[PDB]
Nucleic acid binder design. Sequence first.
DNA 1: GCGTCCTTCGGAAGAGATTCAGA
DNA 2: TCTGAATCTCTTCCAGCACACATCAGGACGC
RNA 3: GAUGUGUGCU
Lengths: 1358, 49, 98, 50, 79
Amino acid sequence: EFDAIKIALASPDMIRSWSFGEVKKPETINYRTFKPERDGLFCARIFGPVKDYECLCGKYKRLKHRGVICEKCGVEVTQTKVRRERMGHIELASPTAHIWFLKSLPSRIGLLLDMPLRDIERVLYFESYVVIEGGMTNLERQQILTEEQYLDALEEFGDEFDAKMGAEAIQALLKSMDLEQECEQLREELNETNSETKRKKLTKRIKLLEAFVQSGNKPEWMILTVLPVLPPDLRPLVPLDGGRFATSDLNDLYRRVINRNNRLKRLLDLAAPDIIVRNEKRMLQEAVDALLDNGRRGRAITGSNKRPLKSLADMIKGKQGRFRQNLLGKRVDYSGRSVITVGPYLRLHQCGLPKKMALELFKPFIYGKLELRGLATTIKAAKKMVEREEAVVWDILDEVIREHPVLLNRAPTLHRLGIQAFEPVLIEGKAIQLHPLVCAAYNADFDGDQMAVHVPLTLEAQLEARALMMSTNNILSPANGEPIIVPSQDVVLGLYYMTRDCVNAKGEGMVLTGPKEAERLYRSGLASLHARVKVRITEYEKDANGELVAKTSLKDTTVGRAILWMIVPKGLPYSIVNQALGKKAISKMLNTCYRILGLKPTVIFADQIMYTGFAYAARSGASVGIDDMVIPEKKHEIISEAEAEVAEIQEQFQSGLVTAGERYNKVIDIWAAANDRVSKAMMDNLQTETVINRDGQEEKQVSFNSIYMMADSGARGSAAQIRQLAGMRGLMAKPDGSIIETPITANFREGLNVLQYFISTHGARKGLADTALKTANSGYLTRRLVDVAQDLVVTEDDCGTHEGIMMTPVIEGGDVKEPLRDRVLGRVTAEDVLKPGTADILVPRNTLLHEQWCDLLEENSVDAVKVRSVVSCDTDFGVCAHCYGRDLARGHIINKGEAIGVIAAQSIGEPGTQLTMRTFHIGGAASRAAAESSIQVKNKGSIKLSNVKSVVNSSGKLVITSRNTELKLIDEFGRTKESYKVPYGAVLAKGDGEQVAGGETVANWDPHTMPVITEVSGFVRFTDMIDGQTITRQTDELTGLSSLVVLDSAERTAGGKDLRPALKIVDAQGNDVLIPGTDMPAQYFLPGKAIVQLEDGVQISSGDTLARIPQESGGTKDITGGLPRVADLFEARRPKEPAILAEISGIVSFGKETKGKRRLVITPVDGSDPYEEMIPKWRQLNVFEGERVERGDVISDGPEAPHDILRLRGVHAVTRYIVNEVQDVYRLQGVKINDKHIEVIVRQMLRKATIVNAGSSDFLEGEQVEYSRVKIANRELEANGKVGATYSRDLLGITKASLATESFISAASFQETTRVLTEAAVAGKRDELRGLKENVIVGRLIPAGTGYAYHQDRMRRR
Amino acid sequence: RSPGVFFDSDKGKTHSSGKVLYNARIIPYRGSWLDFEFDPKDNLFVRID
Amino acid sequence: HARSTGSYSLVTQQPLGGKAQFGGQRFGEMEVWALEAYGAAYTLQEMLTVKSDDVNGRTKMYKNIVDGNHQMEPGMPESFNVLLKEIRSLGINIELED
Amino acid sequence: DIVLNPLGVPSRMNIGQILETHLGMAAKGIGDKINAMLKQQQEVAKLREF
Amino acid sequence: ARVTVQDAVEKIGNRFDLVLVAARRARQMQVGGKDPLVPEENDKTTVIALREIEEGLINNQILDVRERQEQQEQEAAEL
DNA sequence: GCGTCCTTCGGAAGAGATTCAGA
DNA sequence: TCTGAATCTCTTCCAGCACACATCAGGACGC
RNA sequence: GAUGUGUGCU
Ligand SMILES: [Mg+2]
Ligand SMILES: [Zn+2]
Ligand SMILES: [Zn+2]
C-alpha cells in the first residue's frame, strides 16, 4: 500500500484543496430537530450527510440515487462515515501567525528573519511596527518602531515607504526575503568570523535556510491565510438527557475563531476606525493561537469553572493524546477481567477460565460451530441459543476451548513474563485460577488482584501463543539465565521440612531397599520423615554421548530425601537432594535439570516438585505460634552497652570534640552495631536451640523452630524481618532519606510504646509513600529506555569482527561479587583464550561458550577473556547473533530477528520499579551499613597497591595521600583474590609486596572526617583567612585556642568570593618549602565546612592531619534512594566537578600565569603542540612540570564525566564504565542483570558521530549525522580510491538519543510532540517506517519477530 | 495554612551555589499575597501575587 | 467481566472502557512492549487492528471467525487516520507516500 | 472453619493476628466452659463462681 | 495432545520460521481440504501442524515443493 | 419556562537568551 | 571592548491497569 | 466524553 510518511508545511492552496467547503457561521446543531445549520461547524453540504445514504432535505433516501447531489439543500448522498474524512477551511480576513512556529524554541520565524522573539511578538500583537522596505531614509529592513516613532517617521518621511504591524507585516517580511542570497551571505560571514557563539548562531540559521530551500516549504507558509477545520465526526456533539448538548472544546474554539473572523470581515467592509480594527485583528490572532496550541501564550482561555479547554495540540500531545492513549496502546475486543485464585491442581500450561467468562469471550467461535453442526440456521438463532445457555452450548464451548490458548496479563506488565499463554481449563466460578509457579513471574499474589484474559484469534496468533508466549516456554528469565518458575514460600517449606534430618526417628538405624520402601515406611508410620537411614538408589548419568548408565550404590540419606528422589528425572546426580533444600538449592536443581536434560523434563520436574512440596507442607502442620519467637536473654545488656556509649558520645560532643554533623554519624554507627549484635545473639539463640538425645545423651542440631524454619528455607522472611520479631526493631528512615537519630529498642513480640510506634510510623509512611510517589520516576526510566532502544533487532548472524570488550571478575571492595563465569557465560568470545600453558589455545575464536566451556575456563583459572560485545559490533541497523551472545531465555544462541533492544530495556527498567514498589516489606528499617573502618585481609597472599602517592608517618608507617588508590590482595600463585578501596588520609600498618597473615588489619582510618594530611614539615601560615570574611572562628579564652570553621560558598560574602583559604607550609626562615621531586610550594587548599585544630605557626611533621572535613553521608540506601544514579548514567549527565583528563599525550608544562584560571601546555615529542587547557584554581593537579602523560590520564581528581572517557579512552572504556557503575548500583540491592542489556543501551546511546572533515564524502564540516550512515558512506568510498570522512563518536542520553532519531514519528510519540513535529514540518522530513513503534502506530507487523521474515521479503521485493 | 506571615527558607537548590535565600510570605484569608524575598546579591525584592 | 464484539467509541473506533458499559480491557503501551519482546508480531497486529481501531477488517474477522476460518485481513487503524486529520487541522501537512 | 497461611505472619510483621488468635481461643474456651456448665442445668452458684 | 513444542523447534531451528510454517500448514488443513499427514486425535489444526512439524515429515521446503507439485498438477488438468 | 448570544504555591534538568568579565 | 563563562528565564516531564459515585454541557435577559 | 472525589493490586 504505502512505504513512507512525509510531513511538510501546508500551503494555503493545499489547505483549500483539502477543504470540501468553507465554514463561515458559528452555529452547531440548532438545539432542535437534530439537523446541521446552513454553513456552520456541522453541515451536510460541506462535510457530509448526517444519516447514511439519506439526503438532508428529504429528496433522496436509498442507494439507488448514490453519488448524486441534491438541489433543495445541495448535499450529495453517500455513506455517512465520510463526515470523518472531509475537512473544511476558514478564509481568514487577515493573516495570522502560526503559534507553533513562533513560541516553540527556537522560534523559526525568529531565526529566519534574524529578529529576537520579543520584537516579532510585539509586532504580531499590534504593539509596535516593523520597517518593511525602508527605502531612502535612516530605517533598516528589520527596525522596530513604536507608535511615537511611527508617527515621527510618518510626519518627516511621508513618502511611499510603508511600515505595517501584525501578521501581515511578518508575512510580507517572509515573502520578500530571498533564501539563496541570504544563505550565501551567511556562508561568507561564517567563513569570515571566528567567535564560536557567532559561528554556532550563523550555522544554525544556515541549517534552517538549507532545510527551507531543499524542501518544498516556503517562508510565507508559516503565516496562516486559510485555517482548516477538523471533520465533525472527530469532534462529535453527543446529545445528553434532555435538550442540551455536550460541552465540546474544539467546537468552542472554532466558534470563537469564526466569531472573531466574521467580526473582522464585517469591520473591514464598513471602514471601521484604525484602533478598533487593529484590536479586532489582535483578538483574531489570540483566538487562532488558542485554537492551535492553547496555553502557550500568556493565559489559557477556560470554558467553564476555570479549566483550560484542550486545543488541537493538547489532544495530540501528552499522556492523554492520540499517540500514547490510542495508538501505542488500545482497548481490545475478546478480552476479560476477574480476580485470581490459586487452584494448585493445575499444570504449567493450564489456567482456569470461569465457565461464564469463556462463553462470552469465545462467543463467535461458538456461533461458528453451532452453525456448522446445524443446530442453528442463521446468526440470530445461534445468538439466542448462546444467550439462553442451553445444555448443548457448553459442549460446543468445551470443543472450541480445547487447544485455544488465552493470554493472561497482569496490570503492571513490567517485563515480558507479565504476558503468558495458558491452555484454558473450564471451571465453575468467577475467579481465574493461576498456576502457583508463574506467580513469581507475574509478581501476583492472591490478595485481591485481577488479571486480564485475551483471546488469540487467528492461526498465527494461536501459534505465537503456543510456541512463544506459552508459560511452558517461559521457564528462564530474559534478564538473567536463572530460572523464573521457581517454587516459592510454600513448596520450598515443604521441600525443606521433607529433606531434613534430626538425630532420632521412629526408625533410624534401619537400612532400606529403595525409595519406594522409604515412602511405604513413612506412609505406614513406621519411620519419621527426618530419619537417617541407608537407602539403595539407582542414579543415572549421561557422562557418555547421551547414554544413561546406571550406578547403584548405598548412600547415607534421610527418608524424606529418598521419597523426594522418586520425582527427580533420570540423568541427574543424587547429590542435589541429599541436603537441606532451601529456595536457592531447588532453584539450582531446576537450573541444572534444564541445562542437562532439556525443557520437557524440566517442566515435568517443576510440576512434580510443586505437587510434592504442597503435599508434604500440608502433611507437616508447619504453623507459627507466639512461643516460636524466642527472645534472647542478653538483648538489654547490649542495649545498656550502646546507651552508655551514646552517653559518652554526648559528653564528647557537648565538650566540643565533634560537631553536630558527626554526632549523628557516630550514634547511627553505634546503634547499628548494637542492632547487629542483638540480631546475631537472637539468631544464635534460634538456629541451634535444639537439645535432643542421640538415643543416649544430649546432642545439638539445627532447630525445628517454625520461624527459623521458614527463615532459613528462604520461604518468606530474612534476617531483618525475623530480627524485628524477636530481636530489636532498630532505627527508622524518614521519607527524605535521613535516618532517625533515636532507635527503637523493642520487637513485635513485646509491645511498643505510645512513642516508639510514633517513631516507627515515620519509616512506615516513608515505605508507603516511596512506592506510590517514586515509582513514577522509575516507570519513566523504563519508558524512555524502551523508546530509545525499540528499533534494535538482530538482523544478521555474524559480522565477522575480532573486536570486543575485556571481561574480568569484579572485585571492588570485598570477595568475588561476580566471578568470571557469571560475567562470561553464554557470550561469544573474540580471540582464542590462552591458558597458563601459554602459546597454546584453550577455546576457538567464535565459540559460544556455555557451561561446559565455563567449567573448562575455571579449571585452568583464567582471569581475562576478551569477549564480543554489542557496542563493538560492525552491523548496520541492528546487531549480529554472535555479537550479542545467548538468548538468556533459552540455552542457545540468539535467533536472527529478535527484538533484543526491548528485552534489554525491560530487563534494566524493572528491578527498579519492582523493588521500589516493595520498599515497605522491611517496614521502615534503616538498612544502612556499619561504616567499616579497617581492612582485615581474610586470605593469604601479598599486597599490590595501585596508583598510590604515599609518604611517611610520625611512627614511620605509610599514610595515603592519593584519592583513587586500591588495596588489592594477590595470593602466592599470582592471581588477585581480594581487593579494597582505601580512602585519602588512611594510615597503613603494612605495605606493598609483603606477605600478610590471614586475619590481621592492614589499613585503618576514620570512616568520617576525611583529613587533608600533608607530605612535608615546617610551620603553617594562615594564608588568605581572616575572621568573619572567610572563616567562622570561636576562641576559648581560658585555653587561648582557636577553632575556626571555614564557611562554604553559601554564607561567604560576595566580596570575599575570590578569597581562597589555604595553608602554606613554611620553614623557620620564611622560605617556601618544596614538594619532593618538584618545584611547586606545598600549598594545600581547605574546602568549606572544614575544621582545623591547629594554631597559626606550629611545627609539624611529614604526614599529619592539619584539618578535618565531615562527611555527613547519611541515607537509607534503598533502591529508591540510589536510583537517580542509573538515570544520571543513562542520561549522561556531567557531574559537578569533572575530573580533568589529558586531551592529548605529551610532555606537560605551564606557560602563562593567572588568566583567572591556571594554564597548562601539553607538548608531544614529535607531532604538533597546539593544546592549552584552562584549569581553574579549585582543584590541585596530580601531574607536575616534568612528567609524561597519555590521553585518558587524569590531570585532576574527581568523578569522571562519561564524555571525556568516550573521546579519549575510546568506546570500550566508556561502555565498561557505564556497565560497571550501573551493575554496582543494581548489585547493591541484590539485583541480578546480565551486562548484555546495559551494553545494548550504551550502543543505542552511541549512534551519532560528528564529522571532522568532509573528505570525499557529501557530509558537512560539523554536522551531527548518524554513525551508521557515516560507516556506510566510508565503506562505500574506501572500496574505490576515494578517501573516507573522519568522524568522532558522540554520547547522548537516553532522552536525547531517542528524540534525535531519524524517524519523526517515534520522536513525536515519545516526548515533545510539538517541538518534534515543528522541526519535522520545517525540514520536510520523510519517515521510512523502520522501527517497532512506527509499525505499531501505523498498524503493521513489527519487524522484530515473526514479522521479521515478512519485512525482509517486502524490503527485498522493491 | 493559617493566615499570617510565614518566613520560609527556599534553602539550597536555588542559584546552584549553595547560598540559602530567605523569603517572607504574608498570606491573608482573603486578598493578595505580599511575598518578600532575598536576592543572591543580598537585595530585598517584593513580589505581589 | 468479559467482552466479545460489542459497542465501540465515537471519535476513535475503539472498544469502550468500563464494566458498567460493555467495554474491553485496555492493552496499554506497556503491554505492547511485552509482545514486541516475545517477537509475537501477528498477535500484536491483531491486537491493535483486528479487534481494535480498524473497522472493515474488524467485521471481516468476525465473519471469518463465524465462517470456520481463523484468518485476518487487516487494514489501517482508524485512530491513525484521526491523528493524520488532527495534524492536518494545524498548518502541518502530513501524508503517506506511495 | 478457616485455614490461613503461616508464612504470611513473619514476612509482614503483623504479629497482632497471632495474639488475637490466642486471645480468641481463650475467650472461646471460657465460653465453652460456660456452655458446658449451662447445657446441663446447674445451680446459679456455680455459674456465678466461674 | 500438545504441551511444549521444543522438539518441533529442534526440527526447525528458528522458533520464528516455525510459527510461519505451522500457520501455513494449519491454513491448508482448515480452509483447504488437505487432510493431515498424521492421525489426528481430536486436536485443532495448529496442534496437528505442530505435530507434523515435530514428526519430521513437513517443513518450509516440503510445503513449498508440494504446493508447486499440486499447482502444476492443476495446470496439467486444465487441458 | 423558551431562546440568541459573546490565581498565586513542586522540582530536577535542559536549551536558548541575556549579561558579565576579563584580556 | 569583543567573546567564552556564568547566570536568567522559559519549557517539558513526572508508572500501569481497574472499579464506584456525581456533575456539565451558556445562563442573562428579552419574551 | 471530560472533569472532581473515593478505592483495589502492584
Ligand atoms: Mg498483590
Ligand atoms: Zn436535499
Ligand atoms: Zn557483530
